[PDB]
Design an enzyme around this catalytic site. Structure first.
Site, mmCIF file in Angstrom:
data_model
loop_
_atom_site.group_PDB
_atom_site.id
_atom_site.type_symbol
_atom_site.label_atom_id
_atom_site.label_comp_id
_atom_site.label_asym_id
_atom_site.label_seq_id
_atom_site.Cartn_x
_atom_site.Cartn_y
_atom_site.Cartn_z
ATOM 1 N N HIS A 165 0.552 -1.132 0.059
ATOM 2 C CA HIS A 165 0.150 0.555 -0.193
ATOM 3 C C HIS A 165 1.002 1.161 0.025
ATOM 4 C CE1 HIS A 165 0.202 -0.188 4.248
ATOM 5 N NE2 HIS A 165 0.551 1.366 4.827
ATOM 6 N N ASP A 217 -0.802 -7.766 1.881
ATOM 7 C CA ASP A 217 0.622 -6.500 1.923
ATOM 8 C C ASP A 217 1.529 -6.023 1.928
ATOM 9 O OD1 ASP A 217 1.063 -3.990 1.903
ATOM 10 O OD2 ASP A 217 -0.918 -3.150 3.391
ATOM 11 N N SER A 231 3.869 2.137 8.481
ATOM 12 C CA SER A 231 4.035 0.988 7.106
ATOM 13 C C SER A 231 5.236 0.550 6.891
ATOM 14 C CB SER A 231 2.664 1.625 6.354
ATOM 15 O OG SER A 231 1.337 1.217 7.095
#
Lengths: 254, 31, 58
Positions: free
Chosen positions: A43, A99, A205
């Site tokens: 992402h 992810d 992230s």
């Protein structure tokens, strides 16, 4: 990183910073796994579909950093990406499953006291370490508090933050969110009663979730910061991409 | 490369331990 | 004035730090917010320009 603390110099020599000047919109973490490969979350490389952009690049990978803002001359190295490989089954408007994304650097980086690769888990490591109650370490330059724009007090850290969190029982993760979790992700963080806080937050992230093997003294990457409802909330936990279950894809791609 | 991955120059290679590292070891010994 | 311009900015569950623009209907201008990387709601623009072109008035 919320409730974390300033890392020491060289604490995570595998911490990589994904940065972009224009649009500034980028801060994400990544991990150095070889002299030519970086691992991050899928992402951090995408855009909303109404943007229609799919070129995906112009990003700088800054390796060897401690300070978020300052340029570290004889310490950090900035590299260009040759190629980006996002898991072809990553699903945002769905399960947020798989992810994971790998990035090939233009030219191999050169290790030093500040730059050094993490080990990827093998069957054994996965078995020894991925157990409820066992602590891992999360590092990042993300927000220090849950924020949609600006917050009270400081907001972003001046130097890399670290926080050690415990892996939580699958059932507890399952019952902590309405989002359908998959075997490819795990959750960590303290429970409300454990009198300790800590979490990954916006900007974190892609960063690594690592564990030190008490058998060989080596640090292994067990997860990748991915998502969570808020940052450091009671009853909520952060979810990480299960590196071991994706190890084969990593290998195949490399 | 992988051969000596995970061993941090300023720490493991120097037989040095960071300040919260043991908190991790402790949780493996029945955590 | 599409309906999604009236909705507040949504960061989402993902933890990336993606600076984006949303139409602040109450102020009538586009402002920046931190988007998380996934589950973008429509009031999420690449630039103020795109933001104003699409939500200029709402």
């Amino acid at each position: 990183i919320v409730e974390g603390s300033d890392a020491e110099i060289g604490m995570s020599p595998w911490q990589v910073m994904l940065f972009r000047k224009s649009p500034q919109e980028l801060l994400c973490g990544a991990s150095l796994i070889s002299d030519r490969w970086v691992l991050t979350a899928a992402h951090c490389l995408l855009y909303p579909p109404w943007d229609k952009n799919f070129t995906e690049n112009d990003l700088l990978v800054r390796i060897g950093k401690h300070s978020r803002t300052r340029y570290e001359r004889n310490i950090e190295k900035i590299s260009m990406l040759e190629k980006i490989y996002i898991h072809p089954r990553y699903n945002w408007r769905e399960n947020l499953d798989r992810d994971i994304a790998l990035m090939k650097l233009k030219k191999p980086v050169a290790f030093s006291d500040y730059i050094h690769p993490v080990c990827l888990p093998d069957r054994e490591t996965a078995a020894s370490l991925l157990q409820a109650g066992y602590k891992g370490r999360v590092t990042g330059w993300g927000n220090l508090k849950e924020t949609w724009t600006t917050n009270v007090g400081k907001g972003q850290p001046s130097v890399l933050q670290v926080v050690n969190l415990p892996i939580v029982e699958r059932p507890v993760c399952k019952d902590s969110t309405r989002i359908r979790i998959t075997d490819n992700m795990f959750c960590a963080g303290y429970k409300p009663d454990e009198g300790k806080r800590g979490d990954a937050c916006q900007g974190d992230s892609g960063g690594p979730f690592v564990m030190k093997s008490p058998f060989n003294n080596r640090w292994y990457q067990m997860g990748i910061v991915s998502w969570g409802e808020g940052c450091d909330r009671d009853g909520k936990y952060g979810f990480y991409t299960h590196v071991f279950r994706l190890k084969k894809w990593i290998q195949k791609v490399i | 490369g992988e051969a000596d991955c995970g061993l941090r120059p300023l720490f493991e290679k120097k037989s040095l331990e960071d300040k919260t590292e043991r908190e991790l070891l402790e949780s493996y010994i029945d955590g | 004035r599409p309906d999604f311009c009236l909705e507040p900015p949504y960061t989402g569950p993902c933890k990336a730090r993606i600076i984006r623009y949303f139409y602040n209907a109450k102020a009538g201008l586009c402002q920046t917010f931190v988007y998380g990387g996934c589950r973008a709601k429509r009031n999420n623009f690449k630039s103020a320009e795109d933001c104003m072109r699409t939500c200029g008035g709402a």
